[PDB]
Amino acid sequence: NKTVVVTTILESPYVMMKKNHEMLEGNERYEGYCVDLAAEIAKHCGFKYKLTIVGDGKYGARDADTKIWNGMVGELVYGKADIAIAPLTITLVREEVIDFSKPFMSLGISIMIKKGTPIESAEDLSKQTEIAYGTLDSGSTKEFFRRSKIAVFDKMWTYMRSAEPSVFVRTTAEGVARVRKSKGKYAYLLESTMNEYIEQRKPCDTMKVGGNLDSKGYGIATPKGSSLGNAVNLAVLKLNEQGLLDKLKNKWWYDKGEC
Amino acid sequence: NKTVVVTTILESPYVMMKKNHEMLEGNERYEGYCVDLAAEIAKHCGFKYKLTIVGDGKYGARDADTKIWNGMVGELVYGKADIAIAPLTITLVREEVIDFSKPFMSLGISIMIKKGTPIESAEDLSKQTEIAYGTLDSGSTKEFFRRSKIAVFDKMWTYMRSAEPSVFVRTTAEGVARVRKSKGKYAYLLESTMNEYIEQRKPCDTMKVGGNLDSKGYGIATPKGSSLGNAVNLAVLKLNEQGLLDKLKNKWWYDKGEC
Numbered sequence: 326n327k328t329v330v331v332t333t334i335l336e337s338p339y340v341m342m343k344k345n346h347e348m349l350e351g352n353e354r355y356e357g358y359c360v361d362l363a364a365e366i367a368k369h370c371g372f373k374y375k376l377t378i379v380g381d382g383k384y385g386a387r388d389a390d391t392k393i394w395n396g397m398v399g400e401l402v403y404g405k406a407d408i409a410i411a412p413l414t415i416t417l418v419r420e421e422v423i424d425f426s427k428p429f430m431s432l433g434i435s436i437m438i439k440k441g442t443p444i445e446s447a448e449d450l451s452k453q454t455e456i457a458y459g460t461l462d463s464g465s466t467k468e469f470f471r472r473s474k475i476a477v478f479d480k481m482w483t484y485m486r487s488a489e490p491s492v493f494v495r496t497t498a499e500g501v502a503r504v505r506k507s508k509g510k511y512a513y514l515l516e517s518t519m520n521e522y523i524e525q526r527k528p529c530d531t532m533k534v535g536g537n538l539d540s541k542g543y544g545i546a547t548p549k550g551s552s553l554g555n556a557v558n559l560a561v562l563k564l565n566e567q568g569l570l571d572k573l574k575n576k577w578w579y580d581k582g583e584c
Numbered sequence: 585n586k587t588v589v590v591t592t593i594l595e596s597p598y599v600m601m602k603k604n605h606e607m608l609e610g611n612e613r614y615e616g617y618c619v620d621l622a623a624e625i626a627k628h629c630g631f632k633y634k635l636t637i638v639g640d641g642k643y644g645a646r647d648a649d650t651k652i653w654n655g656m657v658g659e660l661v662y663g664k665a666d667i668a669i670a671p672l673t674i675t676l677v678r679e680e681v682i683d684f685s686k687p688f689m690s691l692g693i694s695i696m697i698k699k700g701t702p703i704e705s706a707e708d709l710s711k712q713t714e715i716a717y718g719t720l721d722s723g724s725t726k727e728f729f730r731r732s733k734i735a736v737f738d739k740m741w742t743y744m745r746s747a748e749p750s751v752f753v754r755t756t757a758e759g760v761a762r763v764r765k766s767k768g769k770y771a772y773l774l775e776s777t778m779n780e781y782i783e784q785r786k787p788c789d790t791m792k793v794g795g796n797l798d799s800k801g802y803g804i805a806t807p808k809g810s811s812l813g814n815a816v817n818l819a820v821l822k823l824n825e826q827g828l829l830d831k832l833k834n835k836w837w838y839d840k841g842e843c
């Protein structure tokens with residue numbers, strides 16, 4: 326009945342503007358894993374949709390003072406969008422305010438190092454300072470450390486807040502560039518699937534090391550109580566059971582791997 | 585207000601009767617990952633509960649003719665139980681009739697072989713018949729092959745239905761015993777976490793080989809629309825974010841590993 330407003334965020338390889346986007350229009354201007362996923366969900370559910378980019382460039386958190394939700398979660402909470410399709414982590418605080426489909430992708434926080442860096446685990450990082458390490462300055466990865474009550478991760482958080490120069494980065498691109506240019510003196514903590522994607526990108530100078538720090542999942546989000554939630558969740562399960570989600574990851578991660 | 589009726593199934597290491605169960609009573613007669621998980625969920629949600637064992641020993645499927653749901657899913661569908669806490673796979677057909685929490689455990693179908701068996705992948709199995717291979721005769725693993733439209737898995741299903749003697753087993757214990765006694769001539773297809781658990785059990789003669797065939801998750805189930813669903817889902821997310829689910833797996837899988 327009404328075109329579905331999808332909120333998403335520019336982040337390779339999930340959503341990217343095509344090289345020739347200036348000659349294109351509407352949803353066709355974009356490409357990537359989430360662009361393909363959105364089309365698949367829309368096809369299965371039978372709805373038309375419009376891809377829009379989240380205004381504040383955030384995933385979703387609530388300001389402790391104003392109690393206002395930002396990011397894509399906020400767009401859903403305040404009715405600015407009907408669905409969020411992005412690498413959005415399912416978390417308890419977000420679950421309380423919006424609906425989430427079952428996971429369409431599994432991941433965990435992981436360590437990205439420049440090849441040759443003498444680090445094999447989070448415990449290794451926590452015990453030293455010569456090799457700096459940090460996370461994005463917004464998002465679930467940062468929140469994991471900030472809220473952790475596990476000794477090793479809490480120590481890492483205390484290290485991150487007090488380390489100089491700042492170990493935080495504004496974007497994935499910045500984090501990756503920092504690892505690449507720091508001669509092994511910076512390790513980036515990020516979600517495993519992003520680590521995996523970057524490991525297959527030229528100059529092929531990074532790698533994922535150690536096991537993941539946690540086990541989470543990305544889910545499609547809708548406003549709490551939205552009648553679209555049920556259908557979208559069944560669509561995700563259908564796509565997974567058909568093997569289409571695995572094919573989608575292979576397409577954007579490995580089929581054209583550069584290493 | 586009312587004691588919550590939990591339905592579960594005997595399956596190591598999820599639910600097992602304690603060695604001294606005859607001297608015990610109620611929930612204390614049982615031990616295992618799901619017994620611990622049920623206690624944790626009940627603690628977080630603030631409810632009292634009773635562990636009961638599913639009468640028909642099945643997880644949950646709908647008879648094509650009678651349209652009746654069996655297993656733990658059926659107990660929920662027909663109101664015989666309030667919640668199912670077991671290694672129950674989240675699937676589309678089940679999702680349509682009952683509510684599921686987000687996954688508390690991730691897994692995928694995998695291959696279990698006797699050490700020394702010349703098999704490294706499902707494709708390897710599909711191309712031959714000397715080494716027989718099968719699944720449980722009920723459940724999601726069998727259903728994966730029966731419903732698959734992927735060439736390799738459909739070929740494997742056609743092989744399973746026509747292979748002699750029957751390659752199907754009634755229980756995990758039977759499947760494991762068959763692998764152990766078949767001198768490398770039987771490979772068992774089962775959920776990865778069970779494969780991992782068995783690999784750390786004496787006689788230490790089995791091993792998990794190749795990558796998983798799919799990526800799924802186990803979820804806590806409740807009757808559709810149950811007011812208990814929300815709280816239970818938040819409890820699962822809370823336990824995961826606290827690191828308790830990882831600790832629980834380590835406790836029942838590796839802390840006392842025998843290999």
Ligand SMILES: N[C@@H](Cn1c2c(c(=O)[nH]c1=O)CCC2)C(=O)O
Binds near residue numbers: 384385465466519
């Ligand atoms: N998934 C997180 C957002 N996020 C993302 C990446 C990461 O490494 N860390 C992180 O917090 C890469 C893609 C998105 C959220 O939902 O806040």
Ligand SMILES: N[C@@H](Cn1c2c(c(=O)[nH]c1=O)CCC2)C(=O)O
Binds near residue numbers: 722725756
């Ligand atoms: N999880 C499946 C049940 N199930 C289980 C195991 C397996 O290897 N295969 C399988 O189908 C081991 C534990 C339970 C379902 O929900 O039907």
